[PDB]
């Protein structure tokens, strides 16, 4: 049939859903998810460094490269932040996701000794989300202003901000900051009634 | 000027309060015709006889787990 | 090693200016539309803040607002989770109970009644 | 078993004392090297009003996170980054605020 | 097309005369007000009513070239000519 | 114990016998696409869209029709169920015009949401498309019958619940027109709900017409004022303007419908309203002044006068926050003599005890009633939502309703027991047409209207209800927890004022004339130039000033029901909190802020800082208005009946007739709907 995509390598990739799980720590594994030839593993925050030393230079799983270090902010759970370490193997040609969970204000074990690229993405998470990282060298603000309040992404505060309007007013050199007036964002109440998808709805 | 009393649907603090509401309150309307005595309460809360004074004052008296004879005595002292 | 577990109420550290204490949150599940007869917007909690002053701008015709925290809708799975998140932010919340649809026995046999006055006239 | 950020209960307060000691010595550096702007005396008063807002000490985690945040927003002016008087001005001077009163706010336009 | 105000400024498509006490009139002092010469309201009545033989006719601008969704109009009523929701075009019989 | 185990896609679910396939699917979380079926309305298998295939069956059955028996595996996502939904959707849209841009319904449309998800991507259709001649139904409802999918839902609405009987199917096949054949101008109660009943853009609101699309307007929940029942309706705002008001589903407030006089009159709040504070000039006419200057002129008289010579007359569009603040400004600064606009009896413990002030029986409790012995009142004119509830209690369950006191047009039956106050006195004793039915009943309820109560025979009608109710319930009628007497207040503020501690009626102002009267939202004819025999100094504070506003010295502008965020009391006795949807126009302020600023300008200042501070002070005065959306029944009804019976009063000679006893009478009422472009157009066409 024309229009959908076919999958065949799902069973070959599902073996890692058993392989990493057969190492069997309550310290690491917890829950394993696999869909459309991609693996998602969510790992307890206490162990991150010993988890990422594995899958690195290991004979069966040789990743060595960290491409993305994205973070998911979600208010539904008690653990607010879901930091996703996206790894890519160049020897075996496969992608894996090392998910974690952190609450409002708890430090995670940062992967500075494991990955040399992590530190730049680690500064980005501390800016956008406010998730502090332990054993990190020089934690600095990159994207935010040098006098910025709050954390730019957090779903707690609005899209427009708080110190948005900047005048060149009566003071000769000083640019104004604390004025909070802006043009209104038309938040369209668009959400379609009737559930479009089966095998997703959960009973109360 | 008007007196107000809080009554609950629960058992504690309303065993003696409802007894004053059924036996004493019916006679209280006959005893004090000019002075308005309104006790309109049904929500689950701690009972209190918060009665307003003549002008620019309000005093609240506790009625939690009080005796039926003690409730009639406290209401008589508050009225004077 | 070294736990130092302390039990205390949540406080706002990464918080904006004095506007949290004045604004009140209304964590209430959104009601189904009058015209649209589908339940998908329901069964999910929404924490919408109370709307402040809005006026027509002298620049053109749009209605610009000074209030920053207004145009945000949050999602929650549980009523207890939404109440805990509101206390964590700092803002005072007024929670409303979810109005569940009552099960009414609507049978087709009632339309063609003999003794009952529930007989449907003209189809 | 549980994360502690940096310090446990008592030592976190001593870190604030360490932070206040360092930031009190940096206000002459933000006038002579940076720009005069206001005053040396008013600059030290700008410190006091910032810490008076943080009177709600309840957790070791909340205090330590504010210390780490304080070791960046006040560390910015030690190793001088681009601000040029327009940035790093915490005190509001351009805008005049309305006082909290039932007769004053209702006359102007609030809530 | 539209009637000129006693104040000075010309009225638009809708009756939009600025108030005498209103301060929003300084904008048109010096620089001219852009008011369209062709008014759409008068152009509806200007177009003649076309005659239909059959009961139901479908309205179109000019096929797929001129933008119009194909709407069928019922012509059972004798009084008041039937018009589509898009054009000001009217149909009889 | 009356439970059947069945499978939805192989998953176990327990259901009551008699329930439909769609009702069983709602339990697990599934929702089958529908067009005829409604939660409040009856069942019809017209459209045949809710097709769901159960295994081991040759034909696919509808979710509307079939009752669930033992052992069924209902397959929602089978090969045949998907083909059934895709098939019928193509039939529904084959003869339906391309009107989505010109359609009044946008994202809310049921055909749009379902055809995208369940229907096919492309249509086989080449030639056809029927066209339907539109019928002008009314000035309130715009009707384009070309878009109608002949679903038969409005026809069932007008017949079973509204009880008007005008809409009906005429013709066969394609040539079938929904509507009235005789071209009759359809105008009745609950007619502003038929626009929400219709799933497609066939029936729509004419006053609203074209302003915003469903996705564009931000929804906000609020309790509707100027109605006795107090229906919940989500008000939509499109950038600082109230565009449309649509009802939300609620168990207590009748059903999922709003009143016809409440829904259509959205433009009334926007047409005429006080923007700037107006004070009486030296010439005579009222002129616009500054907020600091206008308050100083009002405080100069308020602080000067002291004693019983200062009284406030408030009623109509008044809030609970306004009630707690005006009582704190009058009783504390001077002697308390505050009066209510609506007349209510207070001779035999009227204001005292919650059982006498408000209706004892719940608004949802009308369904579980054996016989309703209503007093001289019109349910069609006053509270259309309560009249629908009484009709639904009559349609679903067998219950004989009796209405004594002037015959009027009603949706139910008749069974009127004369038209006299003497007939009510005979009903208390061993009556011949009545009393016998009241004695042999499961749960009888007597509903006394405020329309007859606000007359010369106030205490006489109250004693007949207390004497009649006391002799019926206590003797043999009531068997446990059951209400006997009910009072439904016509005014919106009348139920709230009695609970707070306001003196009901204008008799308090008539007995002793005040020097300066601060009438908060004066609408009813109680205070006038002839009524007050001194220098006026009248202060008017309320939104939309047409009547009462010219006879005032210092008028201060206030916020409407959509503006101010404050609690409101229902007829049953429930506090519903309203949220602010739009900012007040001009220099107008909130009701709680207006009285607090007046105290701040004067010497004596009331303890209030914020909305939370005003809510805390309101909780201390009355705990019933503290908890939102929670109603509790009042105790000791026999004690209140004994105190009321002590007073002696003669019955009136004139029959108990309602002031509003017409279909056109319930269009322009209570002054709030009087200054409206939509209501005045409807009332003029009602006679013509
Ligand atoms: S009823 Fe729905 S599908 Fe039909 S024209 Fe209107 S919006 Fe479009
Ligand atoms: S007008 Fe609407 S509700 Fe009535 S039959 Fe047609 S589609 Fe159904
Ligand atoms: S919705 Fe069931 S047959 Fe139409
Ligand atoms: Zn056209």
From Swiss-Prot, chain A:
Self-association and partners: Core subunit of respiratory chain NADH dehydrogenase (Complex I) which is composed of 45 different subunits. Interacts with NDUFAF3. Interacts with RAB5IF. Found in subcomplexes containing subunits NDUFS2, MT-ND1 and NDUFA13.
Sequence similarity: Belongs to the complex I 30 kDa subunit family.
Compartmental location: Mitochondrion inner membrane
Function of the molecule: Core subunit of the mitochondrial membrane respiratory chain NADH dehydrogenase (Complex I) which catalyzes electron transfer from NADH through the respiratory chain, using ubiquinone as an electron acceptor. Essential for the catalytic activity and assembly of complex I.
Chief place where the protein resides: mitochondrion
Molecular function per GO: NADH dehydrogenase (ubiquinone) activity; NADH dehydrogenase activity
Membrane topology qualifier: Peripheral membrane protein
Assigned GO CC terms: mitochondrial inner membrane; mitochondrial membrane; respiratory chain complex I
Species of provenance: Bos taurus
Superkingdom of this protein's organism: Eukaryota
Protein encoded by which gene: NDUFS3
Reaction(s) the record says it catalyses: a ubiquinone + NADH + 5 H(+)(in) = a ubiquinol + NAD(+) + 4 H(+)(out)
Entry keywords, A to Z: Electron transport, Membrane, Mitochondrion, Mitochondrion inner membrane, NAD, Oxidoreductase, Respiratory chain, Transit peptide, Translocase, Transport, Ubiquinone
Protein name (Swiss-Prot/TrEMBL): NADH dehydrogenase [ubiquinone] iron-sulfur protein 3, mitochondrial
Enzyme class: translocase
GO biological process: mitochondrial electron transport, NADH to ubiquinone; mitochondrial respiratory chain complex I assembly; reactive oxygen species metabolic process
Curated annotation (Swiss-Prot), chain B:
Topological category with respect to the lipid bilayer: Peripheral membrane protein
Annotated disulfide bonds: 8-42
Alphabetical UniProt keywords: Acetylation, Disulfide bond, Electron transport, Membrane, Mitochondrion, Mitochondrion inner membrane, Respiratory chain, Transport
Record has NADP as a keyword: no
Statement: the UniProt record of this protein carries the keyword Metal-binding: no
Modified residues annotated as N6-succinyllysine in this record: 48
Residues that bear N6-acetyllysine: 48, 59
Subunit architecture: Complex I is composed of 45 different subunits.
Function field: Accessory subunit of the mitochondrial membrane respiratory chain NADH dehydrogenase (Complex I), that is believed not to be involved in catalysis. Complex I functions in the transfer of electrons from NADH to the respiratory chain. The immediate electron acceptor for the enzyme is believed to be ubiquinone.
Protein name: NADH dehydrogenase [ubiquinone] 1 alpha subcomplex subunit 2
Swiss-Prot record, chain D:
Keyword rRNA-binding appears in the UniProt entry: no
Principal subcellular localization: mitochondrion
Keyword Magnesium found: no
Xref: InterPro entries: Complex1_LYR_NDUFA6_LYRM6 (IPR045299), NADH_Ub_cplx-1_asu_su-6 (IPR016488)
GO biological-process terms attached to the record: mitochondrial respiratory chain complex I assembly
Domain of life of the source: Eukaryota
Record keywords: Acetylation, Electron transport, Membrane, Mitochondrion, Mitochondrion inner membrane, Respiratory chain, Transport
Topological category with respect to the lipid bilayer: Peripheral membrane protein
Protein family (similarity comment): Belongs to the complex I LYR family.
Subunit structure: Mammalian complex I is composed of 45 different subunits.
Job description of the protein: Accessory subunit of the mitochondrial membrane respiratory chain NADH dehydrogenase (Complex I), that is believed to be not involved in catalysis. Required for proper complex I assembly. Complex I functions in the transfer of electrons from NADH to the respiratory chain. The immediate electron acceptor for the enzyme is believed to be ubiquinone.
Listed name of the protein: NADH dehydrogenase [ubiquinone] 1 alpha subcomplex subunit 6
Protein source organism: Bos taurus
Swiss-Prot record, chain F:
Record's catalysed reaction(s): a ubiquinone + NADH + 5 H(+)(in) = a ubiquinol + NAD(+) + 4 H(+)(out)
Residues annotated as domain 2Fe-2S ferredoxin-type: 2-80
First-listed, main subcellular location of the protein, grouped into a coarse class: mitochondrion
Organism encoding this protein: Bos taurus (Bovine)
Gene3D superfamilies: 3.10.20.740, 3.30.200.210, 3.30.70.20, 3.40.50.740
GO terms (BP aspect): mitochondrial electron transport, NADH to ubiquinone; mitochondrial respiratory chain complex I assembly
SS bond list: none
Protein name: NADH-ubiquinone oxidoreductase 75 kDa subunit, mitochondrial
Function: Core subunit of the mitochondrial membrane respiratory chain NADH dehydrogenase (Complex I) which catalyzes electron transfer from NADH through the respiratory chain, using ubiquinone as an electron acceptor. Essential for catalysing the entry and efficient transfer of electrons within complex I. Plays a key role in the assembly and stability of complex I and participates in the association of complex I with ubiquinol-cytochrome reductase complex (Complex III) to form supercomplexes.
Membrane topology of the entry: Peripheral membrane protein
GO cellular component, one term: mitochondrial intermembrane space
GO MF: 2 iron, 2 sulfur cluster binding; 4 iron, 4 sulfur cluster binding; metal ion binding; NADH dehydrogenase (ubiquinone) activity
Domain 4Fe-4S His(Cys)3-ligated-type residue range list: 80-119
PTM annotation (N6-acetyllysine): residues: 56, 471, 681
Domain of life: Eukaryota
Residues involved in [4Fe-4S] cluster 2 binding: 148, 151, 154, 198
Lineage: Eukaryota, Metazoa, Chordata, Craniata, Vertebrata
Binding site for [2Fe-2S] cluster: 36, 47, 50, 64
Protein's gene: NDUFS1
Pfam families in the cross-refs: Fer2_4, Fer4_NDSU1, Fer4_Nqo3, Molybdopterin, NADH-G_4Fe-4S_3, NADH_dhqG_C
Cofactor binding description: Binds 1 [2Fe-2S] cluster per subunit.
Chain positions recorded as [4Fe-4S] cluster 1 binding sites: 96, 100, 103, 109
């Amino acid at each position: 049939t024309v229009r959908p995509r076919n999958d065949v390598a799902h069973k070959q990739l599902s073996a890692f859903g058993e392989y990493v799980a057969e190492i069997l720590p309550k310290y690491v594994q917890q829950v394993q998810v696999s869909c459309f030839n991609e693996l998602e593993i969510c790992i307890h925050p206490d162990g991150v460094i010993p988890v990422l030393t594995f899958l690195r230079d290991h004979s069966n799983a040789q990743f060595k490269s960290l491409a993305d270090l994205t973070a998911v902010d979600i208010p539904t759970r008690q653990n607010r932040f879901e930091i996703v370490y996206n790894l890519l193997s160049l020897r075996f040609n496969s992608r894996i996701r090392v998910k974690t969970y952190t609450d409002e204000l708890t430090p995670i074990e940062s992967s500075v000794p494991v990955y040399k690229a992590a530190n730049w993405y680690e500064r980005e998470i501390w800016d956008m989300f406010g998730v502090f990282f332990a054993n990190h060298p020089d934690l600095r603000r990159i994207l935010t202003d040098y006098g910025f309040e709050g954390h730019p992404f957090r779903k707690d505060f609005p899209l427009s901000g708080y110190v948005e309007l900047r005048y060149d007013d009566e003071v000769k050199r000083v640019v104004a900051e604390p004025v909070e007036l802006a043009q209104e964002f038309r938040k369209f109440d668009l959400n379609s009634p009737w559930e479009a998808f089966p095998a997703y709805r959960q009973p109360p | 000027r008007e007196i107000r009393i809080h009554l609950c649907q629960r058992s504690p603090g309303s065993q003696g309060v409802r007894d004053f509401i059924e036996k004493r309150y019916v006679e209280l309307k006959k005893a004090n015709p000019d002075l308005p005595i309104l006790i309109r309460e049904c929500s689950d809360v701690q009972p209190k006889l918060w009665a307003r004074y003549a002008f620019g004052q309000e005093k609240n008296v506790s009625l939690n787990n009080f005796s039926a004879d003690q409730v009639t005595r406290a209401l008589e002292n508050v009225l004077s | 090693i070294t736990v130092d577990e302390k039990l205390d109420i949540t406080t706002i550290t990464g918080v904006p200016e004095e506007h949290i204490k004045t604004r009140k949150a209304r964590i209430f599940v959104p009601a189904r539309n009058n015209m649209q007869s589908g339940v998908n917007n329901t069964k999910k909690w929404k924490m919408e803040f109370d709307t402040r002053e809005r006026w027509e701008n002298p620049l053109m015709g749009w209605a610009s607002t000074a209030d920053p925290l207004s145009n945000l809708v949050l999602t929650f799975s549980t009523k207890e989770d939404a109440v805990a998140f509101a206390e964590k932010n700092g803002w005072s919340y007024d929670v409303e109970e979810r109005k569940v649809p009552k099960p009414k026995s609507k049978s087709y046999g009632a339309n063609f009644s003999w003794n009952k006055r529930t007989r449907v006239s003209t189809k | 078993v549980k994360p502690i950020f940096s310090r446990d209960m008592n030592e976190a307060k001593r870190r604030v004392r360490e932070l206040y000691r360092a930031w009190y010595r940096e206000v002459p550096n933000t006038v002579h090297l940076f720009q005069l702007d206001i005053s040396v005396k008013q600059g030290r008063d700008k410190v006091r009003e910032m810490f008076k807002k943080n009177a709600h000490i309840t957790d070791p985690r909340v205090v330590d996170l504010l210390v780490i945040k304080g070791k960046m927003e006040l560390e910015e002016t030690i190793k001088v980054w681009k601000q040029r008087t327009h940035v790093m001005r915490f005190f509001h001077e351009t805008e005049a605020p309305r006082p909290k009163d039932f007769l004053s706010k209702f006359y102007v336009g609030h809530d | 097309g539209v009637r000129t105000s006693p104040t000075g400024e010309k009225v638009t498509h809708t009756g939009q005369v600025y108030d005498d006490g209103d301060y929003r009139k300084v904008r048109f002092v010096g620089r001219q007000k852009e008011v369209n010469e062709n008014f759409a309201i008068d152009l509806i009545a200007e177009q003649p009513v076309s005659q239909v033989g059959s009961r139901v006719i479908s309205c179109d601008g000019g096929g797929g070239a001129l933008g119009h969704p194909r709407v069928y109009i019922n012509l059972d009523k004798e009084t008041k000519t039937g018009t589509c929701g898009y054009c000001g075009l009217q149909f009889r019989q | 114990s009356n439970l059947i185990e069945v499978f939805v896609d192989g998953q176990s679910v327990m259901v009551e016998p008699g329930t439909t396939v769609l009702q069983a699917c709602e339990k697990v979380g599934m929702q089958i696409p529908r067009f005829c079926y409604h939660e409040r309305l009856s069942v019809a298998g017209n459209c045949r869209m809710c097709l769901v295939e159960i295994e081991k069956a040759p034909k696919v059955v509808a979710a509307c029709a079939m009752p669930v028996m033992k052992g069924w595996n209902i397959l929602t996502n089978s090969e045949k169920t998907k083909k059934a939904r895709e098939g019928v959707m193509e039939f529904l849209l084959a003869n339906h015009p391309l009107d989505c841009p010109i359609c009044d319904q946008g994202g809310e449309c049921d055909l749009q949401d379902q055809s995208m998800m369940f229907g096919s991507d492309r249509s086989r259709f080449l030639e056809g498309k029927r066209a339907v001649e539109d019928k002008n139904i009314g000035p309130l409802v715009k009707t384009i019958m070309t878009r109608c999918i002949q679903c038969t839902r409005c026809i069932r609405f007008a017949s079973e619940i509204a009880g008007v009987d005008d809409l009906g199917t005429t013709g066969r096949g394609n040539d079938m027109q929904v509507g009235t054949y005789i071209e009759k101008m359809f105008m009745s109660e609950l007619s502003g709900n038929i626009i929400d009943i219709c799933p497609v853009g066939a029936l729509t609101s004419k006053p609203y017409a074209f302003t915003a699309r469903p996705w564009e307007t931000r929804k906000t929940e609020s309790i509707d004022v100027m109605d006795a029942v107090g229906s919940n309706i989500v008000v939509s705002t499109r950038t600082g303007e109230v565009m449309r008001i649509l009802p939300r589903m609620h168990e207590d407030i009748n059903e999922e419908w709003i009143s016809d006089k409440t829904r259509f009159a959205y433009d009334g709040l926007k047409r005429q309203r006080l923007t700037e504070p107006m004070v009486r000039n030296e010439k005579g006419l009222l002129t616009h002044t500054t907020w600091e200057d206008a308050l100083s002129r009002v405080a100069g008289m308020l602080q000067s006068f002291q004693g019983n010579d200062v009284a406030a007359i408030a009623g109509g569009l008044v809030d609970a926050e306004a009630l707690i603040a005006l009582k704190d400004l009058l009783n504390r600064v001077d002697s308390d003599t505050l009066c209510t606009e609506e007349v209510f009896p207070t001779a035999g413990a009227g204001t005292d005890l919650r059982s006498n002030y408000l209706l004892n029986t719940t608004i949802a409790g009308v369904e579980e009633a054996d016989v309703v012995l209503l007093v001289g009142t019109n349910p069609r004119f006053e509270a259309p939502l309560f009249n629908a509830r009484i009709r639904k209690s009559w349609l679903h369950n067998d219950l004989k309703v009796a209405l004594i006191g002037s015959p009027v047009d009603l949706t139910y039956r008749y069974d009127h027991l004369g038209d006299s106050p003497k007939i009510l006195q005979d009903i208390a004793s061993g009556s011949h047409p009545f009393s016998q039915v009241l004695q042999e009943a499961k749960k009888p309820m007597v509903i006394l209207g405020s329309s007859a109560l606000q007359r010369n025979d106030g205490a006489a009608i109250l004693a007949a209800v207390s004497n009649i109710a006391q002799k019926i319930r206590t003797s043999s009628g009531v068997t446990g927890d059951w209400k006997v007497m009910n009072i439904l207040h016509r005014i919106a503020s009348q139920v709230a004022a009695l609970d707070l501690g306001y003196k009901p009626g204008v008799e308090a102002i008539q007995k002793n004339p005040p020097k300066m009267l601060f009438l908060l939202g004066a609408d009813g004819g109680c205070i006038t130039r002839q009524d007050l025999p001194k220098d006026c100094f009248i202060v008017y504070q309320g939104h939309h000033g047409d009547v009462g506003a010219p006879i005032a010295d210092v008028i201060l502008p206030g916020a409407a029901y959509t503006e101010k965020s404050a609690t409101y009391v229902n007829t049953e006795g429930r506090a519903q909190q309203t949220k602010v949807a739009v900012t007040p126009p001009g220099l107008a302020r909130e009701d709680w802020k207006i009285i607090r600023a007046l105290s701040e300008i004067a010497g004596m200042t009331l303890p209030y800082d914020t909305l939370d501070q005003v809510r805390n002070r309101l909780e201390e005065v009355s705990p019933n208005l503290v908890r939102y959306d929670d109603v509790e029944g009042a105790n000791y009804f026999q004690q209140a009946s004994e105190l009321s019976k002590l007073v002696n009063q003669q019955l009136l000679a004139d029959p108990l007739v309602p002031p509003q006893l017409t279909i056109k009478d319930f269009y322009m009422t209570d002054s709030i709907s009087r200054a409206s472009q939509t209501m005045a157009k409807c009332v003029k066409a009602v006679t013509e």
